[PDB]
Amino acid sequence: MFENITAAPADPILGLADLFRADERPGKINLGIGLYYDETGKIPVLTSVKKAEQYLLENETTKLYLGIDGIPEFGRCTQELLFGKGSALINDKRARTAQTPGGSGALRVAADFLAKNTSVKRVWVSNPSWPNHKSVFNSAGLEVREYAYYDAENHTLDFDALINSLNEAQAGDVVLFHGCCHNPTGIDPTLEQWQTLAQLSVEKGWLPLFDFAYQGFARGLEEDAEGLRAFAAMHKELIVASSYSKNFGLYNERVGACTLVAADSETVDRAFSQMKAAIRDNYSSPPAHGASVVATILSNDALRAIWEQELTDMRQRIQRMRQLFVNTLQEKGANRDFSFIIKQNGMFSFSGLTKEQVLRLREEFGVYAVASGRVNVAGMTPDNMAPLCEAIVAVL
Amino acid sequence: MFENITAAPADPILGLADLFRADERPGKINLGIGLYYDETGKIPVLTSVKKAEQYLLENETTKLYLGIDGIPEFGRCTQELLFGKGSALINDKRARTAQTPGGSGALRVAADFLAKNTSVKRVWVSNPSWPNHKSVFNSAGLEVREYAYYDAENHTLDFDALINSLNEAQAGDVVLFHGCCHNPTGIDPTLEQWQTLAQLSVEKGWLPLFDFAYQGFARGLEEDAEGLRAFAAMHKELIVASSYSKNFGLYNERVGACTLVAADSETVDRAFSQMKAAIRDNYSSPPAHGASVVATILSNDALRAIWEQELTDMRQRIQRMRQLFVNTLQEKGANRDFSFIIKQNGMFSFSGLTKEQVLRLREEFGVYAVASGRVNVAGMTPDNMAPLCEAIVAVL
Ligand SMILES: O=C(O)CCc1ccccc1
Ligand SMILES: O=C(O)CCc1ccccc1
């Protein structure tokens, strides 16, 4: 049965982990997959997380299956983060949240739900895009088309091209937006631009799907959700696939959420029953530990305070590395001005390095980035900055 | 987009949790979903598990993403449990294991892998069947057909009917077997019958898919794997979807495995790359906590000893409840002899109660079973036995 199966192509992002592990050279620098490193060059467990895990160890008395949609408190805390405490969406019971195994799990659940229960055939994603969107949506039998987004000459959101390319999107198409810290460009709509897009979306009949994996990494928790909230104010229906991987440092525990919004409570409940069916046919019910940690932290004033400060500290360290990166490139004699990198939001810098420069960086220098030119600034430290910048200067 | 969506039908098993929660009557008895309860009528966390969780709390320094196939030690320990230490399958590197979110996740991954990468169109399941098999395989676009299995008059495996119904299975069809503790009948093939089936399977060209969620609950860890090992000795290719939900009491942490076996290392590696692709397009990578607990326990002599005794204790308590159930029914004046229940393996008794008797049990008596007549013996205790048996006698 398996004799003729062809090997799967390496994933542009995920395939980096294997390569890095097989590289026996010391002093290699991992700027590939988007994880937060601290100044010591390690990926720590957050203190608030360890505290929550200790509480769970001391207090859990069962591992009895969660509901298909997960921990109820987790859903409530999620909707507050997404929509704001006292949001009309919450007051009107227009939203239902399934806890999922990561934002990745939420994207698959959304895609399966849409494919099986609606007339959706096409999802629009930005160019450039995060590769897993195409993979996941295609897997569910959905076409993926690209809309213009980034002006690489100005290093800006090409709003004109964006709007013009989305004219090709039909009513009933899905349009995917990143809530903040667009991956990979780090370029987000302004509030006005979000508001313009929200209006356009309503007029054109698009179903908005927000991928919201970086809440807190652009400006802050509430500010980062402005765009999503602009959309929520204008739309009867939307979906959010959100993640706690990055903002809680909980990557491997697979903690995210698929949130479904409809016009009213009756509609969302009916629709959400089919979203639960799509989960039942997949992994049945979500993993408790990571989501319990999130709910524990978000529902305790003291833990929440510690956690929110940890998140601020992460954002601020990345901002320091961003500036030091730009400064060190210039002092190492870079043949390009890289000041545009300061404008970018989140963990990455979309550097303009070619695919061949990225390959040479890895082969010659043991510096690992994504072939798109995306580099993980959250993987930079005072100690590795000089070597990594010397390497970049050498390949320019 | 969501206006016309029809509500999803209630799941025969999973829908019980909601109903039970909405039932405000005290002294209701939950014999529905298959969880292990102790004598106090609660679903405890295993001591070995708590010990492992304390070790993880003290020693984990990162939540960095696992590989797509999960923790390497988890896979190794899994293959040892499935195939035996020093198995030729392990020596010859013919098996690859992906850690998954439950056996349920493993079933979906297997189905997606098969649908996308082979000519499989049909999966054969026993009658009666575990409902999630049809749901999951249908979701992946695979037809599901039933083979005869249980003789309800004799309360036995109708081996003749089994073999005769499977004549309709074509070469290249999948045939699903339960490794032990057939759900719901509790009736398993003898070793000779497994060996006969293994030979027949090879002759007929079926791809065997084992659902192995109850290793240790029939007779013991090694004995329960005899059937699977009989098949492994005879086949070039098979798949195992196994679970640690029940044997570790880790239900809500979603700990299972999809194990792929091919003729040789080259073939399995090539095929497994597409199994990883099917994961990438789903939840990306599996949840660490539950699987780390399993690996920690299985790889430490002292924890393993404690854990294996806990598993024995669970099996033995269920066996005591099985006998007490039969004894109490007879002394409560049951109008049927229920001695056939002693022969059944695992957590359940497939009682012969009609769908209407089950409904009346719930409505009138607050006793919750599955409409198929399946009752969770592992949910019985000395304290709830009298009331539950009085209820059953009343509806006969
Ligand atoms: O590196 C990234 O783009 C974020 C981390 C990640 C990558 C692929 C799947 C899930 C998360
Ligand atoms: O009750 C059962 O049959 C076992 C528990 C279960 C039920 C449905 C999906 C996964 C596990």
Side-chain angles (χ1 to χ4, degrees):
Chain A
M1 309 274 285
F2 308 148
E3 303 99 304
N4 203 53
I5 296 184
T6 299
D11 193 271
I13 295 174
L14 295 178
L16 291 178
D18 269 0
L19 291 178
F20 192 89
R21 276 197 226 90
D23 195 338
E24 301 158 301
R25 296 173 297 175
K28 39 185 205 291
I29 301 168
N30 194 339
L31 307 175
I33 306 176
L35 296 122
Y36 175 80
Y37 298 71
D38 63 23
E39 211 176 34
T40 74
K42 296 189 170 201
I43 303 165
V45 181
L46 291 186
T47 295
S48 56
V49 166
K50 283 286 184 183
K51 284 172 81 60
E53 287 186 321
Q54 181 175 13
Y55 175 85
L56 293 183
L57 176 67
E58 289 167 348
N59 292 276
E60 279 188 6
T61 58
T62 191
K63 302 292 195 177
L64 167 166
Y65 288 108
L66 305 174
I68 298 175
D69 48 353
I71 301 171
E73 179 72 39
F74 178 88
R76 292 189 289 269
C77 292
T78 289
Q79 297 187 191
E80 287 189 33
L81 230 17
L82 296 182
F83 303 129
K85 225 253 184 170
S87 166
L89 273 71
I90 299 175
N91 289 348
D92 295 338
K93 299 184 203 294
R94 284 180 50 211
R96 295 297 294 277
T97 291
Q99 174 200 324
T100 49
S104 291
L107 291 161
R108 186 56 186 277
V109 170
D112 286 347
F113 160 79
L114 291 178
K116 272 64 235 191
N117 298 281
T118 69
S119 54
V120 170
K121 300 148 295 96
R122 199 161 310 96
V123 179
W124 296 79
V125 304
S126 62
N127 171 232
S129 55
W130 188 62
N132 261 207
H133 289 142
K134 181 167 163 60
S135 290
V136 170
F137 300 124
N138 280 172
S139 89
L142 269 13
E143 193 195 357
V144 174
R145 279 278 57 261
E146 287 196 289
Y147 61 83
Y149 188 80
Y150 185 62
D151 175 339
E153 247 104 314
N154 294 250
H155 306 100
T156 189
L157 210 176
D158 193 339
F159 200 65
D160 278 358
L162 175 318
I163 287 176
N164 289 131
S165 53
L166 277 178
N167 269 157
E168 197 183 344
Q170 290 173 359
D173 288 357
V174 171
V175 179
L176 192 151
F177 298 101
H178 294 45
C180 72
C181 305
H182 183 266
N183 187 340
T185 69
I187 301 301
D188 298 330
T190 63
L191 210 224
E192 283 196 12
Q193 286 174 331
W194 277 125
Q195 286 170 147
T196 294
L197 288 171
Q199 306 178 130
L200 184 64
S201 180
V202 167
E203 284 169 13
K204 256 45 158 85
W206 309 329
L207 178 66
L209 192 170
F210 276 78
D211 182 327
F212 199 23
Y214 291 98
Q215 180 170 196
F217 280 100
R219 289 177 293 153
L221 292 173
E222 297 304 301
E223 300 170 76
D224 287 5
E226 281 174 0
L228 171 61
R229 288 172 202 180
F231 265 70
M234 290 291 96
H235 284 78
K236 292 186 192 157
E237 298 169 336
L238 57 79
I239 294 166
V240 188
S242 64
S243 176
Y244 298 105
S245 284
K246 286 104 180 214
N247 60 197
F248 281 80
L250 279 172
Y251 316 91
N252 73 186
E253 301 297 6
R254 323 302 300 120
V255 196
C258 191
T259 294
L260 180 62
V261 174
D264 51 42
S265 179
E266 184 277 332
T267 301
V268 79
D269 290 351
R270 209 170 65 253
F272 191 63
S273 78
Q274 293 289 1
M275 181 167 283
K276 290 201 274 182
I279 291 158
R280 184 264 324 264
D281 289 345
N282 187 347
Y283 53 83
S284 186
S285 67
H289 180 81
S292 307
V293 164
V294 168
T296 294
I297 289 164
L298 291 180
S299 71
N300 184 91
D301 291 346
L303 288 188
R304 189 168 173 138
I306 292 164
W307 164 69
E308 198 180 340
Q309 187 61 47
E310 290 184 293
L311 176 55
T312 292
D313 289 346
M314 291 194 277
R315 185 179 64 250
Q316 292 179 166
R317 198 194 81 77
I318 301 164
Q319 296 179 158
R320 293 193 295 274
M321 291 304 92
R322 208 168 274 286
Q323 189 61 70
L324 179 67
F325 184 46
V326 169
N327 289 350
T328 304
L329 290 170
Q330 60 179 71
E331 88 191 19
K332 245 72 220 186
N335 68 19
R336 299 174 65 209
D337 165 38
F338 287 95
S339 51
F340 68 86
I341 289 170
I342 306 298
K343 293 73 212 57
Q344 296 174 1
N345 284 151
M347 293 202 188
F348 303 112
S349 99
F350 198 52
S351 62
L353 291 162
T354 59
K355 72 193 190 293
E356 291 80 7
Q357 286 168 336
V358 173
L359 183 57
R360 178 172 178 205
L361 276 166
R362 181 210 306 150
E363 316 269 63
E364 174 167 10
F365 298 101
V367 172
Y368 284 67
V370 183
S372 61
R374 191 196 79 178
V375 312
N376 186 188
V377 176
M380 307 176 180
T381 67
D383 285 334
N384 74 17
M385 192 66 77
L388 78 87
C389 293
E390 285 162 2
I392 290 169
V393 167
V395 307
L396 293 171
Chain B
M1 309 274 285
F2 308 148
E3 303 99 304
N4 203 53
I5 296 184
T6 299
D11 193 271
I13 295 174
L14 295 178
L16 291 178
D18 269 0
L19 291 178
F20 192 89
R21 276 197 226 90
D23 195 338
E24 301 158 301
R25 296 173 297 175
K28 39 185 205 291
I29 301 168
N30 194 339
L31 307 175
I33 306 176
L35 296 122
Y36 175 80
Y37 298 71
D38 63 23
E39 211 176 34
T40 74
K42 296 189 170 201
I43 303 165
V45 181
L46 291 186
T47 295
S48 56
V49 166
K50 283 286 184 183
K51 284 172 81 60
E53 287 186 321
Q54 181 175 13
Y55 175 85
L56 293 183
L57 176 67
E58 289 167 348
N59 292 276
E60 279 188 6
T61 58
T62 191
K63 302 292 195 177
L64 167 166
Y65 288 108
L66 305 174
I68 298 175
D69 48 353
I71 301 171
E73 179 72 39
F74 178 88
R76 292 189 289 269
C77 292
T78 289
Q79 297 187 191
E80 287 189 33
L81 230 17
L82 296 182
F83 303 129
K85 225 253 184 170
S87 166
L89 273 71
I90 299 175
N91 289 348
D92 295 338
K93 299 184 203 294
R94 284 180 50 211
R96 295 297 294 277
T97 291
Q99 174 200 324
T100 49
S104 291
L107 291 161
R108 186 56 186 277
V109 170
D112 286 347
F113 160 79
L114 291 178
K116 272 64 235 191
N117 298 281
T118 69
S119 54
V120 170
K121 300 148 295 96
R122 199 161 310 96
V123 179
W124 296 79
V125 304
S126 62
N127 171 232
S129 55
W130 188 62
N132 261 207
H133 289 142
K134 181 167 163 60
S135 290
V136 170
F137 300 124
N138 280 172
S139 89
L142 269 13
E143 193 195 357
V144 174
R145 279 278 57 261
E146 287 196 289
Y147 61 83
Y149 188 80
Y150 185 62
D151 175 339
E153 247 104 314
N154 294 250
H155 306 100
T156 189
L157 210 176
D158 193 339
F159 200 65
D160 278 358
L162 175 318
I163 287 176
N164 289 131
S165 53
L166 277 178
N167 269 157
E168 197 183 344
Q170 290 173 359
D173 288 357
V174 171
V175 179
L176 192 151
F177 298 101
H178 294 45
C180 72
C181 305
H182 183 266
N183 187 340
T185 69
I187 301 301
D188 298 330
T190 63
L191 210 224
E192 283 196 12
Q193 286 174 331
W194 277 125
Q195 286 170 147
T196 294
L197 288 171
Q199 306 178 130
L200 184 64
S201 180
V202 167
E203 284 169 13
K204 256 45 158 85
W206 309 329
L207 178 66
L209 192 170
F210 276 78
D211 182 327
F212 199 23
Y214 291 98
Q215 180 170 196
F217 280 100
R219 289 177 293 153
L221 292 173
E222 297 304 301
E223 300 170 76
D224 287 5
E226 281 174 0
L228 171 61
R229 288 172 202 180
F231 265 70
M234 290 291 96
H235 284 78
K236 292 186 192 157
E237 298 169 336
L238 57 79
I239 294 166
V240 188
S242 64
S243 176
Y244 298 105
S245 284
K246 286 104 180 214
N247 60 197
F248 281 80
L250 279 172
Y251 316 91
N252 73 186
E253 301 297 6
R254 323 302 300 120
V255 196
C258 191
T259 294
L260 180 62
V261 174
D264 51 42
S265 179
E266 184 277 332
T267 301
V268 79
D269 290 351
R270 209 170 65 253
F272 191 63
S273 78
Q274 293 289 1
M275 181 167 283
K276 290 201 274 182
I279 291 158
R280 184 264 324 264
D281 289 345
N282 187 347
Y283 53 83
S284 186
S285 67
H289 180 81
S292 307
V293 164
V294 168
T296 294
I297 289 164
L298 291 180
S299 71
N300 184 91
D301 291 346
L303 288 188
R304 189 168 173 138
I306 292 164
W307 164 69
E308 198 180 340
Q309 187 61 47
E310 290 184 293
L311 176 55
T312 292
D313 289 346
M314 291 194 277
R315 185 179 64 250
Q316 292 179 166
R317 198 194 81 77
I318 301 164
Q319 296 179 158
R320 293 193 295 274
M321 291 304 92
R322 208 168 274 286
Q323 189 61 70
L324 179 67
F325 184 46
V326 169
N327 289 350
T328 304
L329 290 170
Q330 60 179 71
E331 88 191 19
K332 245 72 220 186
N335 68 19
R336 299 174 65 209
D337 165 38
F338 287 95
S339 51
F340 68 86
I341 289 170
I342 306 298
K343 293 73 212 57
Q344 296 174 1
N345 284 151
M347 293 202 188
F348 303 112
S349 99
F350 198 52
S351 62
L353 291 162
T354 59
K355 72 193 190 293
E356 291 80 7
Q357 286 168 336
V358 173
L359 183 57
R360 178 172 178 205
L361 276 166
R362 181 210 306 150
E363 316 269 63
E364 174 167 10
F365 298 101
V367 172
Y368 284 67
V370 183
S372 61
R374 191 196 79 178
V375 312
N376 186 188
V377 176
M380 307 176 180
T381 67
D383 285 334
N384 74 17
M385 192 66 77
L388 78 87
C389 293
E390 285 162 2
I392 290 169
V393 167
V395 307
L396 293 171

